[PDB]
Paper text:
S1 nuclease from [name] (EC 3.1.30.1; NCBI sequence ID: XP_001818636; S1–P1 nuclease family in Pfam, PF02265) is an extracellular, single–strand–specific, sugar non–specific, Zn2+–dependent, fungal nuclease with 3'–mononucleotidase activity with a pH optimum in range 4.0–4.3. S1 nuclease has the phospholipase C/P1 nuclease–like fold stabilized by two disulfide bridges. The active site is located in a surface cleft and composed of the obligatory catalytic trinuclear zinc cluster supplemented by Lys68 and the nucleoside binding site 1 (NBS1; also called Phe site in the previous studies). A cluster of three zinc ions coordinates the substrate/product scissile phosphate and the reaction mechanism utilizes water activated by Zn2+ ions as a nucleophile.
A phosphate ion inside the zinc cluster in the first binding mode is modeled with occupancy 0.5. Phosphate ion is a product of 3’–mononucleotidase activity and simultaneously an inhibitor of S1 nuclease. This structure brings evidence for one of its binding modes and for its capability to bind inside the active site. The inhibition effect of inorganic phosphate was tested on ssDNase activity of S1wt under standard reaction conditions. Phosphate inhibits activity by 70% at 10 mM concentration and by 91% at 100 mM concentration.
Author numbering: 21 to 286
């Protein structure tokens, strides 16, 4: 996701964590604001463009070697790769926070976890096709961009009505209410099924697999002919909105559950 997506995921999670989890995080981050997670939720996207953080670029995705829209699926060993991936990063950074939450590596670990749980839920961060769709040029609202970009940024920013922290907060609030009492409030009871703080690979793969099914059902189900030739800010946006909204909600909720586990220090 772009910044708005990551901040919305972070604010959602802030709404569901226990108060000891909040303190646990605020202490690591040195931030006692009511935006403590949101404020660090984009950091990994900065860090990967620095010389020192270049090595972390692959941690944003798992390039699923599947065949969408006909066939979707993710496999850790097949798809992660030689330089690591979202899944291996969640394992490594989760275990740092389980082993040394007060150590020097915990600050970046937590920043990573907040960001990457977000990324795992962007379906094109779980998809190899044309560099996760970065190679698929498309027209969005009369302007040229790419398919990955409109999922990261154009479409969420349109649905949220902007891109500022306060817009992310308002968006998070809307989605959090969907989880509590609205359209997600039944389904959400099963969004943490299979979660296991002692198996970060398996837990994060479930989330990645889940998000990846939407490559076939939604991202690409019209076919590349349509996608390459149609302005995607029309009916494509309308079809995609419920899906990216639910995924951002799942990301927030799952992030909170995972942070509550880490803070509980098993
Ligand atoms: C769509 O465009 C992508 C490149 O951006 C290309 O690889 C693909 O072959 C195109 N497919 C069709 C059906 O136009
Ligand atoms: Zn992202
Ligand atoms: Zn992206
Ligand atoms: Zn990212």
């Amino acid at each position: 996701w772009g910044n708005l997506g990551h901040e919305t995921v972070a604010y959602i999670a802030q709404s569901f964590v226990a108060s000891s989890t909040e303190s646990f995080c605020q202490n690591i981050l040195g931030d006692d604001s009511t935006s403590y997670l949101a404020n660090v939720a984009t950091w990994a996207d900065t860090y990967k463009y620095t010389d020192a953080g270049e090595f972390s670029k692959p941690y944003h995705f798992i390039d699923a070697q599947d065949n969408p829209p006909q066939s979707c699926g993710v496999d850790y060993d097949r798809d992660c790769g030689s330089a690591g991936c979202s899944i291996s990063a969640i394992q490594n950074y989760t275990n740092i926070l389980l082993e040394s939450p007060n150590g020097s590596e915990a600050l970046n670990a937590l920043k990573f976890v907040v960001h990457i749980i977000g990324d795992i839920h962007q379906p094109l961060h779980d998809e190899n096709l044309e560099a996760g769709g970065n190679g698929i040029d498309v027209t969005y609202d009369g302007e040229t961009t790419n398919l990955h970009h409109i999922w990261d940024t154009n479409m969420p920013e349109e649905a949220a009505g902007g891109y500022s922290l306060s817009v992310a907060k308002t968006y998070a609030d809307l989605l959090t209410e969907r989880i509590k009492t609205g359209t997600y409030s039944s389904k959400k009871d099963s969004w943490t099924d299979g979660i296991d703080i002692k198996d970060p690979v398996s837990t994060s793969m479930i989330w990645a697999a889940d998000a990846n099914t939407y490559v076939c059902s939604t991202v690409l189900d019209d076919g590349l002919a349509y996608i390459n030739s149609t302005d995607l800010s029309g009916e494509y946006y309308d079809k995609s909105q419920p899906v990216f909204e639910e995924l951002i909600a799942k990301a927030g909720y799952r992030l909170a559950a995972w942070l509550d586990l880490i803070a509980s220090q098993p």
